[PDB]
């Protein structure tokens, strides 16, 4: 999946604006809720997911296991609102050697600890709306001293409001980004 496609400048996996944004995503809720509401700051629709027990309310990018999201773009960027709650997300990566690492970033964590298959790391979110960019190729080199090949799965847990998830293939500036791939906060 996403194999033999064309990824050159951008690749948007999730967009709140659309007839059905969770086309490819699987959604699992236990004590929470997912919906699409109109945000106030960015006066448009945002897909929000919330609920207790962060580790149980999430959405996986490939519809089902045993199916990978073959994507080779280095940079990964999310556009999220900070609700001042427990928020975490995980991304699995295939190295140059056939080993599936996975890095996750949590806002309720304070120390990074490299492990054979996992790398947990804290995230220092700002207030309100913000876009976060992951190199995702410097990370593999800095953690395991290997090379990035292609992402396999993406997963976002509860207590957040998503607007955009897209691979960038390079760090574009606020100017170079198109209109849809940027944060235009109105008055």
């Amino acid at each position: 999946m996403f194999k033999n496609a064309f990824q050159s400048g951008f690749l948007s996996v999730l967009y709140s604006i659309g007839s059905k944004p969770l086309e490819i995503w699987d959604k699992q809720v236990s004590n929470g809720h997912i919906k699409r509401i109109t945000d106030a700051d960015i006066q448009s629709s945002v897909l929000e997911i919330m609920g207790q027990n962060v580790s149980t309310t999430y959405i996986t990018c490939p519809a089902d296991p045993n199916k990978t999201l073959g994507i080779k773009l280095p940079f990964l960027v999310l556009i999220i609102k900070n609700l001042n709650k427990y928020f975490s997300f995980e991304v699995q990566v295939l190295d140059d050697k056939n080993v599936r690492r996975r890095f996750r970033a949590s806002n309720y964590q304070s120390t990074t600890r490299v492990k054979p298959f996992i790398c947990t790391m804290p995230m220092r979110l700002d207030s309100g709306w913000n876009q976060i960019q992951f190199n995702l190729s410097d990370f593999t080199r800095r953690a395991y001293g290997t090379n990035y090949i292609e992402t396999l799965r993406v997963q976002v847990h509860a207590n957040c409001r998503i607007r955009r998830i897209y691979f960038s293939d390079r760090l574009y500036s606020e100017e170079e980004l198109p209109a849809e791939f940027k944060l235009f906060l109105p008055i």
Binding site: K35, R36, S45, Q52, N84, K85
Partner: protein
């Protein structure tokens, strides 16, 4: 935030006419025409009802099987044997059951006697309030609790008048509001104790407006959390899980699961440096929003 006066009539019409939804069954006993004063019932609203389960339906505990089993059947002469023979859950408590809300409030009684300086202002582009006198010179101590006590109402035009009364008095109140707080807790708690969605969604928006109406109201309210949060803990997790379905209903405020989250965030915002623990004590699921 958004006003509560306008939304209510359009919502009630959209619910009752457009959908096949129910009013549902608002008791109007004792209330006749618009002229005759009602006979106020002695009952009280949001009152916990006794257990109605029978004597015998209670299962008995079998010492031999360690189980609550229902008693056997006493014989009966009509059911006698003939020639051929070859062959416990507990009674649930009304946690989410809408309590009975009688029309025996104090606002209705005062409005019936005609002591209120309010009237409906149809000359406006919509339903507005019309004051016989000037609001900023009223006696809040006497009037403001009366207006809060009408929030529990459902019969028109009492509930519209009561909501619009508090909505307009909180704007011009200012400092005149702070000393009245100890007298507002009983009607607020009584309105919440009704378990009815309409009155609850109204009083939560009014509570937001209340903490915002002036300064220093937050700290002054903090000691009274133990009497207003117990209901928050129930409907804190009543939300809609639509998945991909965009919530058109978001146009108006109906979802308690987040109408409570916004209000708790606001309480922690205004209460100071200690409101968080007083909240966490009552609603344990709460999370600090700072």
């Amino acid at each position: 935030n958004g006003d509560v006066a306008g939304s209510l009539f359009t919502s009630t019409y959209r619910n009752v006419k457009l959908a096949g939804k129910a009013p549902p069954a608002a008791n109007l006993s004792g209330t006749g025409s618009c002229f005759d004063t009602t006979s106020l019932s002695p009952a009280r609203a949001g009152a916990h009802k006794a257990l109605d389960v029978q004597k015998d339906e209670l299962p008995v505990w079998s010492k031999s099987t360690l189980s609550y089993k229902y008693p056997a059947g006493r014989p009966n002469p009509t059911g006698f044997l003939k020639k051929g023979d070859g062959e416990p859950s507990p009674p649930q408590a009304g946690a989410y059951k809408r309590r009975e809300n009688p029309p025996n409030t104090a606002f209705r009684r005062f409005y019936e006697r005609g002591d209120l300086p309010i009237a409906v202002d149809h000359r406006g582009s919509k339903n507005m309030i019309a004051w016989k006198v000037d609001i900023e010179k009223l006696d809040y101590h006497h009037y403001l609790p009366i207006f809060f006590d009408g929030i529990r109402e459902t019969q028109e035009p009492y509930r519209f008048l009561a909501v619009k009364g508090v909505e307009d008095m909180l704007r011009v109140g200012g400092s005149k509001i702070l000393p009245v707080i100890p007298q507002l807790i009983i009607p607020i708690k009584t309105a919440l104790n009704t378990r009815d969605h309409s009155v609850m969604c109204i009083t939560l928006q009014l509570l937001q407006k209340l903490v915002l109406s002036a300064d220093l109201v937050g700290e002054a309210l903090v000691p009274y959390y133990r009497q207003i949060l117990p209901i928050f803990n129930l409907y804190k997790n009543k939300n809609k899980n639509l998945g991909d379905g965009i919530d058109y209903g978001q146009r108006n405020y109906d979802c308690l699961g987040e109408l409570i989250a916004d209000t708790l965030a606001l309480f922690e915002q205004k209460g100071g440096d200690d409101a968080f623990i007083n909240i966490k004590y009552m609603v344990p699921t709460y999370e600090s929003s700072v």
